[PDB]
Design an enzyme around this catalytic site. Structure first.
Site, PDB file in Angstrom:
ATOM      1  N   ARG A 189      -4.261  -3.811  -4.738  1.00  0.00           N
ATOM      2  CA  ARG A 189      -4.170  -2.661  -5.389  1.00  0.00           C
ATOM      3  C   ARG A 189      -4.493  -1.372  -4.849  1.00  0.00           C
ATOM      4  O   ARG A 189      -4.949  -1.446  -3.973  1.00  0.00           O
ATOM      5  CB  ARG A 189      -5.061  -2.767  -6.660  1.00  0.00           C
ATOM      6  CG  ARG A 189      -4.993  -1.755  -7.748  1.00  0.00           C
ATOM      7  CD  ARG A 189      -3.724  -1.430  -8.532  1.00  0.00           C
ATOM      8  NE  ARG A 189      -3.347  -2.404  -9.216  1.00  0.00           N
ATOM      9  CZ  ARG A 189      -2.171  -2.738  -9.750  1.00  0.00           C
ATOM     10  NH1 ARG A 189      -1.021  -1.850  -9.303  1.00  0.00           N
ATOM     11  NH2 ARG A 189      -1.809  -3.795 -10.562  1.00  0.00           N
ATOM     12  N   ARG A 190      -3.715  -0.221  -4.981  1.00  0.00           N
ATOM     13  CA  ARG A 190      -3.782   0.934  -4.384  1.00  0.00           C
ATOM     14  C   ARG A 190      -5.003   1.518  -4.473  1.00  0.00           C
ATOM     15  O   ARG A 190      -5.565   2.219  -3.515  1.00  0.00           O
ATOM     16  CB  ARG A 190      -2.673   1.801  -4.739  1.00  0.00           C
ATOM     17  CG  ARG A 190      -2.421   3.409  -3.935  1.00  0.00           C
ATOM     18  CD  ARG A 190      -1.255   4.075  -4.466  1.00  0.00           C
ATOM     19  NE  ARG A 190      -1.181   5.193  -3.459  1.00  0.00           N
ATOM     20  CZ  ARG A 190      -0.512   5.500  -2.585  1.00  0.00           C
ATOM     21  NH1 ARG A 190       0.111   4.467  -2.066  1.00  0.00           N
ATOM     22  NH2 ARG A 190      -0.507   6.575  -1.962  1.00  0.00           N
ATOM     23  N   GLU A 253       5.816  -8.351  -6.646  1.00  0.00           N
ATOM     24  CA  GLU A 253       5.083  -9.371  -5.743  1.00  0.00           C
ATOM     25  C   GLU A 253       4.839 -10.466  -6.448  1.00  0.00           C
ATOM     26  O   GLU A 253       4.883 -11.770  -5.576  1.00  0.00           O
ATOM     27  CB  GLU A 253       4.156  -8.611  -4.759  1.00  0.00           C
ATOM     28  CG  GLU A 253       4.695  -7.440  -3.754  1.00  0.00           C
ATOM     29  CD  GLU A 253       3.672  -6.693  -3.037  1.00  0.00           C
ATOM     30  OE1 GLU A 253       2.559  -7.105  -3.325  1.00  0.00           O
ATOM     31  OE2 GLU A 253       4.379  -6.009  -2.149  1.00  0.00           O
TER      32      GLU A 253
END
Ligand SMILES: NC(=O)c1ccc[n+]([C@@H]2O[C@H](COP(=O)([O-])OP(=O)(O)OC[C@H]3O[C@@H](n4cnc5c(N)ncnc54)[C@H](O)[C@@H]3O)[C@@H](O)[C@H]2O)c1
EC number: 3.2.2.6
Lengths: 311, 480
Positions: A189-190, A253
């Site tokens: 996660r960013r 993804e």
């Protein structure tokens, strides 16, 4: 007697702190200035380092001889008889020989890190510590450890500039006698999954696993990967909820990893398991894998547990 | 000017007398807290507190409190240990570092083993950080012992203040280490632990100092292979491309000329990431030194001509933009990028190429002789000595170094038929300068098996016999 210039050579060529401090104190108790330690990166020298090196060893007469000629550290290491005699006004051969003695002392104590690829200076120093002065003679010609079996004496005389034939014979003899699709993909996660994914990539590349990080570019990264590691940060499935259009990168993804059927290993860092009925139907199969809790103080056994759960 | 010194000396006299006299369990820690708060008052004065803090550190050293701190770092109590460590962190100036290198090596090295609490580690990382800036001997004594392993283990944590000290410690150990210190770092894989520090989006200074450490380690030619295999260079170029040097110049008071000389060989080490890091840092610090009136330091060192070489030989937009901004913030002109088609040059391109690299004395020497790009690529010793008035062989050798730099970065599309420049570059990137030596003689890939050494010496003009032997060997072994 002349011990003051020897103390200046001790200060300017120091590798020990104790003798340098004692020599600086001895020159301070006398009536002259103390010199500065020279910069060891001699091919990285500009003009001012050459001027300072001249002022510290007793060549103050020729300093203006080098400023007009713009001699830097690259030209100082590649200086011969004729350029000293004609271009620099150093007519006396005894003064030239004193300059070559000081050049020997300089090219012994030098840092060739910016030019030497195969560590040739240690190869010259293992034979005789007076050979490292020819390091710049052999690095600048394009040589390394894998070429010295095809060098002749004329190439050492003309190109490398080795004036002593005994040193040429010893270098030729000692050169001829003893020289001769990633695997782990990590989704993260960013917001809060960057540091944990970077730490997993480092601890997996410490063991020799080719790990990729960071639709026309990531699908071929997942298909070539042997495994799959899902970083579950707090909020790692926040944007994946109610994503019925397949636009989030982590959602793509996860769908691609479920289409591949790889060994999905979740890494949990303070993230509770979500419900199956709130996720979309193309990602409900990720909740049935054997996740691993992450510990920030016992990471070695946790990485060993990850290795025991991967191919 | 002398007000803060006279206000801060007798207070530290009373405080150090209370530290030396009293030996309690918590009053000594309270005295350390008083000295540490006075140090925090000392460093936070605008344009005054630098010399004031230096004088107070000199007073603490001459009183004898540094050995007192080195004794209190061996105390079994944890509280006075962490206050003594946080007090010793803020006083590591260039006159204190010699005294710490004499005695304190081995006491701080003992606390490098104790790694579990954060309150020790956050200060001991900064102490080791400032102790990497002393000399190469102290760097060898710290890396050979368990001083590097403390930083390489503390890179695992998530403390945003501690990782800054770890990145600055690895950068200062890469700057002041030498050959063997960099070998013992990279063989122990110190470049791989900088990957969570160069990618973490929490801070922006921390990634910059991590990429500084990566770029300084990426200049040693025996090291760059494992650095490229580490994968931390690829985070360097977008990070430089996504930031602005003026904001970080306002964020940082610069650095002295001894540290300004450390960023200069990053630009001449022909690596893209190191040139981007050096251009970014010298642009920010050039903005800092151009806010003041000390812009002559870059001309005293010589980084301005290296920035001109970065502009005139650019293959990247980011480092070229940063070098143009750095030359714009200084007081000189910016150069233009040269035309790469060197055999397509007329006289004016040759004059501009002379004006951009520092051959302004001989410009009228080439205008009267009508030297174009075809004559510049085919120029020897004798025509420089006789026809051009360049009598000095050192000036001729500087001209041949600049000619090497030119014939490396050239476009031979109008003359080369068989792509001979890539054939020369696949062996060694310093061979492409002889491309014009072999194309102008009529050679291509289908003739080099019938070339001798005399044809390379006389016609092609290859003066080094090692390069002649390598070209003959690689032409006879793998072309047919
Ligand atoms: N805010 C703070 O807490 C703070 C700030 C600075 C330093 N410190 C402490 O100071 C110690 C390290 O400081 P240092 O002095 O040894 O750093 P340093 O010698 O490693 O770096 C050089 C510093 O001195 C200045 N400098 C030196 N020569 C100069 C010159 N000729 N012209 C202009 N500026 C020049 C530069 O601006 C630069 O900041 C550490 O203990 C650190 O904790 C603390």
């Amino acid at each position: 007697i002349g011990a003051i210039q020897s103390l200046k050579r001790l200060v300017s060529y120091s590798t020990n702190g104790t003798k340098s401090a004692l020599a600086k104190r001895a020159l301070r108790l006398l009536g002259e200035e103390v010199p500065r330690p020279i910069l060891p990166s001699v091919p990285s020298w500009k003009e001012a380092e050459v001027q300072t090196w001249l002022q510290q060893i007793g060549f103050s007469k020729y300093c203006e001889s080098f400023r007009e000629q713009q001699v830097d550290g690259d030209l100082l290491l590649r200086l011969t008889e004729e350029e000293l005699q004609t271009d620099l006004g150093m007519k006396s051969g005894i003064t030239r020989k004193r300059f070559f003695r000081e050049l020997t002392e300089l090219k012994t104590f030098a840092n060739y890190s910016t030019c030497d690829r195969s560590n040739l200076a240690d190869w010259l120093g293992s034979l005789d510590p007076r050979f490292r002065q020819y390091t710049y003679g052999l690095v600048s010609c394009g040589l390394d450890r894998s070429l010295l079996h095809r060098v002749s004496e004329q190439q050492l005389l003309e190109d490398c500039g080795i004036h002593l034939g005994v040193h040429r014979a010893r270098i030729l003899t000692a050169a001829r006698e003893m020289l001769h699709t990633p695997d782990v993909f990590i989704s993260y996660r960013r917001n809060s999954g960057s540091q944990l994914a970077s730490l997993l990539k480092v601890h997996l590349q410490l063991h020799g696993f080719s790990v990729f990080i960071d639709e026309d570019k990531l699908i071929q990264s997942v298909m070539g990967a042997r495994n799959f590691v899902l970083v579950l940060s707090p909020g790692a499935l926040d944007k994946c909820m109610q994503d019925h259009d397949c636009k989030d990168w982590v959602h793509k993804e996860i769908v691609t990893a479920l289409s591949c059927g790889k060994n999905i290993v979740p890494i949990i860092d303070g993230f509770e398991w979500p419900e199956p009925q709130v996720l979309p139907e193309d990602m409900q199969a990720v909740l049935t894998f054997n996740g691993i809790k992450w510990s920030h103080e016992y990471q070695e056994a946790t990485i060993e547990k990850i290795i025991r759960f991967l191919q | 000017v002398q007000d803060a010194l006279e206000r801060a000396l007798p207070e530290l006299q009373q405080a150090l007398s209370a530290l030396k006299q009293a030996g309690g369990a918590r009053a000594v820690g309270a005295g350390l807290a008083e000295v540490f708060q006075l140090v925090e008052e000392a460093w936070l004065l605008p344009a005054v507190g630098r010399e004031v803090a230096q004088g107070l550190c000199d007073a603490i050293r001459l009183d004898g409190g540094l050995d007192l701190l080195l004794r209190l770092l061996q105390a079994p109590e944890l509280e006075t240990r962490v206050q003594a460590a946080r007090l010793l962190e803020q006083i590591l100036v260039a006159e204190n570092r010699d005294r710490v290198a004499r005695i304190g090596l081995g006491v701080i090295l003992n606390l490098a083993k104790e790694r579990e609490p954060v309150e020790l580690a956050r200060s001991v990382a900064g102490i080791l950080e400032h102790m990497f800036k002393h000399s190469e001997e102290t760097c060898q004594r710290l890396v050979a012992a368990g001083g590097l392993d403390a930083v390489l283990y503390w890179c695992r944590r998530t403390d945003p203040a501690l990782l800054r000290h770890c990145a600055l410690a690895l950068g200062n150990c890469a700057l002041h280490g030498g050959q063997a210190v960099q070998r013992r770092m990279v063989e122990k894989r110190a470049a791989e632990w900088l990957f969570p520090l160069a990618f973490s989006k929490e801070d922006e200074l921390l990634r910059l100092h991590a990429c500084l450490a990566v770029a300084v380690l990426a200049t040693n030619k025996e090291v760059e292979r494992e650095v490229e295999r580490s994968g931390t260079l690829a985070l360097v170029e977008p990070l430089v491309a996504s930031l602005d040097p003026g904001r970080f110049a306002r964020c940082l008071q610069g650095r002295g000329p001894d540290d300004l000389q450390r960023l200069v060989p990053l630009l001449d080490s022909n690596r893209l990431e190191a040139q981007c890091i050096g251009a970014f840092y010298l642009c920010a610090e050039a903005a800092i030194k151009s806010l003041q009136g000390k812009t002559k330091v870059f001309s005293d060192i010589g980084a301005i001509q290296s920035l001109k070489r970065l502009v005139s030989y650019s293959t990247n937009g980011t480092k070229s933009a940063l070098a143009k901004r750095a030359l714009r913030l200084l007081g000189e002109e910016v150069p233009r990028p040269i035309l790469p088609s060197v055999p397509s040059w007329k006289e004016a391109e040759v004059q501009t190429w002379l004006q951009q690299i520092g051959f302004s004395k001989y410009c009228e020497s080439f205008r009267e002789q009508q030297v174009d790009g075809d004559l510049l690529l085919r120029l020897t010793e004798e025509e420089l000595q006789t026809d051009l008035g360049m009598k000095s062989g050192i000036t001729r050798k500087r001209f041949f170094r600049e000619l090497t730099e030119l014939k490396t970065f050239a476009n031979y599309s109008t003359c080369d038929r068989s792509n001979l420049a890539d054939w020369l570059g696949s062996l060694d990137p310093r061979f492409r300068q002889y491309t014009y030596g072999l194309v102008s003689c009529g050679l291509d890939r289908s003739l080099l098996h019938r070339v001798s050494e005399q044809q390379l010496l006389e016609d092609c003009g290859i003066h080094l016999g090692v390069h002649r032997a390598r070209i003959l060997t690689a032409a006879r072994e793998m072309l047919h």
